[PDB]
């Protein structure tokens, strides 16, 4: 990825400005629910303003930072992808449930994950990636042993290092793993993305078994789904209380969100606290709330 200079940031801001303008079309009927592109791109712009202001007179230093170069390349790529999506999707952009609109939702989620990562690595606008504090102690030991103080590593390097400690069974399993952990969809793994994955699929000691049980083979798991899409997907099960699905929370990254249909006819979403997801799903099944994953009659046995 090329060196970031002011001129590159200026170009990126112009591309983001074009996306924000496209997304103010009343035909789109965009909801303000997180992830909301008309909040995310302006917030990303403001945080980049902050970074640039902290590095006044240190732009050679900033422009050489490896994480920041990868981030800016990816932000430009994703913003161009969004502009192209509108150009190619034309009138299909305005149909809920069209593929182009699903793509725009997925891009909104990616912009949300990118902003969260940028704020995690550049809190207050200064680079602190090397000092990032990984949440799970056993995961932290892995990262520091394999990568030291690095903030970002290419997927190929991450895959190799992880396989030495937690063997990956197959090529297709590796691709599913990449799809799960590469939240910014840039073929790199940041220490921030690593922290999210190892919090979601803790304990480290059985990391990929947990992920296989909770995501790879579980019909309730929904990759890259938002709050409003969960509510929409459960609508068809409104007369089947106990139907449930679960996903990454977008606004509390590293935590799970479970959506479910109640016997009263509400579709509720809850973030488990003070219990791991395994126990939330087991207890919720036993107590009659989490019965039918994605509305299916059979539920995985996680005991």
């Amino acid at each position: 990825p090329g060196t970031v200079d002011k001129k590159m940031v200026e170009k990126c801001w112009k591309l983001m400005d074009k996306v924000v303008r496209l997304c103010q079309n009343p035909k789109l009927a965009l909801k303000n629910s997180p992830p909301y592109i008309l909040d995310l791109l302006p917030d990303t712009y403001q945080h980049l303003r902050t970074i640039l202001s902290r590095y006044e007179g240190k732009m050679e230093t900033l422009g050489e930072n490896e994480y920041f170069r990868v981030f800016m390349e990816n932000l430009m790529k994703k913003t161009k992808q969004t502009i192209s999506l509108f150009k190619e999707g034309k009138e299909r952009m305005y149909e809920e449930n069209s593929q182009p609109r699903r793509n725009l939702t997925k891009l909104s989620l990616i912009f949300s994950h990118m902003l969260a990562e940028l704020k995690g690595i550049f809190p207050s606008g200064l680079f602190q990636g090397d000092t990032f504090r990984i949440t799970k102690a056993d995961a932290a030991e892995f990262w520091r042993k394999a990568f030291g103080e690095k903030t970002i590593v290419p997927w190929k390097s991450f895959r190799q290092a992880l396989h030495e400690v937690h063997p990956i069974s197959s090529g297709l399993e590796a691709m599913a793993l990449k799809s799960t952990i590469d939240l910014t969809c840039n073929d790199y793994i940041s220490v921030f993305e690593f922290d999210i994955f190892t919090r979601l699929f803790q304990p480290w000691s059985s990391l990929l078994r947990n992920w296989n049980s909770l995501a790879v083979t579980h019909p309730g798991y929904m990759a890259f789904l938002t709050y409003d899409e969960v509510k929409a997907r459960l609508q068809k099960f409104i007369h089947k209380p106990g139907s449930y699905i679960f996903r990454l929370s977008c606004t509390r990254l590293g935590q799970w969100a479970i959506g479910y249909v109640t016997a009263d006819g509400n579709i509720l979403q809850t973030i488990p606290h003070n219990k791991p997801l395994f126990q939330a799903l087991i207890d919720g099944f036993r107590e009659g709330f989490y019965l039918f994953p994605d509305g299916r009659n059979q539920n995985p046995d996680l005991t």
């Binding site: 997180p34 909301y36 791109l41 302006p42 606004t251």
Partner: peptide, 22 residues
């Protein structure tokens, strides 16, 4: 009138996450 990138200030609506059922 269409707002520019630097004119928008985030609304920051939050989705409703409710207490667990168990």
């Amino acid at each position: 009138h269409v707002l520019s990138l630097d004119q928008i200030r985030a609304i920051r609506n939050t989705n409703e996450y409710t207490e667990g059922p168990t």
